[PDB]
Ligand binder design. Structure first.
Ligand SMILES: COC(=O)C[C@@H](C)OC(=O)C[C@@H](C)OC(=O)C[C@@H](C)O
Ligand SMILES: *[C@@H]1O[C@H](CO)[C@@H](O)[C@H](O)[C@H]1NC(C)=O
Length: 318
């Protein structure tokens, strides 16, 4: 199936994600700040360009990664390898961490906050910590097969007594109509992540939730891109990220399409930015340089694929 064009305003696009998907969300929010022009959200991710000049595990396990060079790179690349960082001064930025997360962690997420603080507007930043939550996607309902919010294990989606999807979307878009807590009006569509929509480390197929109101094109809709983390691709947990995270509940009543690009496990070994080589058996988004030296810059193969998907969807704006 081909990815459809919808009546989506190009000025209403944003992105969020968990963990490696949170890292990627920030990579998109920075490198393509012009495309993701409303803002972005990061759940338990870390600094833009964190892993380029220090080993990636230093950007994990609740350590204190350096952001001296990453921040310098943002300044240096502005307007060339990434969109002008001036854009970040007019973006809504949502950030979340569990206080008990020792996989990425408060100390890592705080460095992302500090890094973006060089470029953003504090009034338009929301940084939230959920006490007791580990490395997992925070929701406020018992999604099928959810792990405990106090134990980090597959599918890494939990009832943390906190509606993370709603918090992120409401922060990014401002007011929203109450979420739909019952039968959704729309459908989850599948499309081929092929050609310009695809990249190494990405699955053959992606998904998007389209509310009934966005189907005809009679109504202008917005677009949020939601990125799963490692071990959360469709290959790993089927439709559980798409359904259990709670984005669609909010989208359904707010003329919003949610795009869910899909990574795929890749057992092959790749040279990465520093520290030698690494495989991607968990199907993570590329924040370490698996698929090229420009993973977090314009032209990064995965970011380019996601942006290509976005460009197609908004090309139907009337
Ligand atoms: O744990 C997680 O999945 C969080 C995530 C941010 O960490 C990673 O992305 C780990 C990745 C960079 O390394 C791998 O998973 C490769 C594997 C062979 O170790
Ligand atoms: C803050 O975000 C709002 C969107 O809600 C935007 O209109 C405004 O320009 C931003 N504020 C500043 C001064 O950047």
């Amino acid at each position: 199936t081909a990815l459809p064009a919808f009546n989506v305003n190009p000025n209403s696009v944003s992105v969020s994600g968990l963990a490696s998907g949170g890292y990627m969300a920030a990579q998109l929010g920075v490198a393509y700040s012009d495309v993701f022009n409303v803002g972005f959200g990061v759940f338990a991710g870390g600094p833009y360009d964190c892993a380029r000049n220090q080993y990636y595990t230093s950007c994990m396990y609740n350590g204190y990664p350096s952001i001296t060079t990453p921040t310098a790179n943002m300044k240096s690349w502005s307007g060339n390898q990434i969109a002008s960082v001036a854009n970040l001064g007019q973006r809504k930025i949502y950030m979340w961490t569990g206080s008990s997360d020792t996989t990425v962690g408060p100390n890592v997420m705080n460095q992302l906050k500090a890094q973006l603080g060089n470029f953003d507007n504090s009034a338009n930043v929301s940084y939230v910590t959920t006490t007791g939550a580990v490395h997992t996607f925070p929701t406020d309902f018992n999604g099928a097969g959810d792990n405990s919010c106090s134990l980090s294990t597959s599918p890494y989606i939990s009832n943390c007594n906190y509606d993370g999807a709603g918090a992120a979307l409401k922060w990014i878009y401002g007011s929203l109509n109450a979420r739909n807590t019952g039968t959704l009006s729309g459908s989850v569509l599948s499309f081929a992540q092929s050609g310009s929509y695809g990249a190494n480390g990405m699955d053959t197929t992606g998904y998007l939730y389209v509310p009934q109101s966005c189907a005809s094109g009679a109504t202008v809709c917005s677009l949020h891109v939601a990125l799963h983390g490692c071990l959360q691709s469709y290959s790993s947990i089927g439709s559980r990220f798409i359904q259990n995270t709670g984005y669609n509940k909010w989208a359904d009543t707010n003329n919003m399409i949610i795009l869910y690009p899909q990574a795929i496990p890749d057992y092959t070994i790749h040279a990465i930015w520093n520290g030698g080589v690494l495989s991607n058996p968990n199907g993570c988004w590329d924040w370490v340089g698996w698929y090229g030296s420009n993973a977090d810059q314009i032209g990064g193969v995965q970011m380019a694929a996601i942006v290509g998907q976005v460009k197609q969807i908004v090309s139907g704006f009337q």
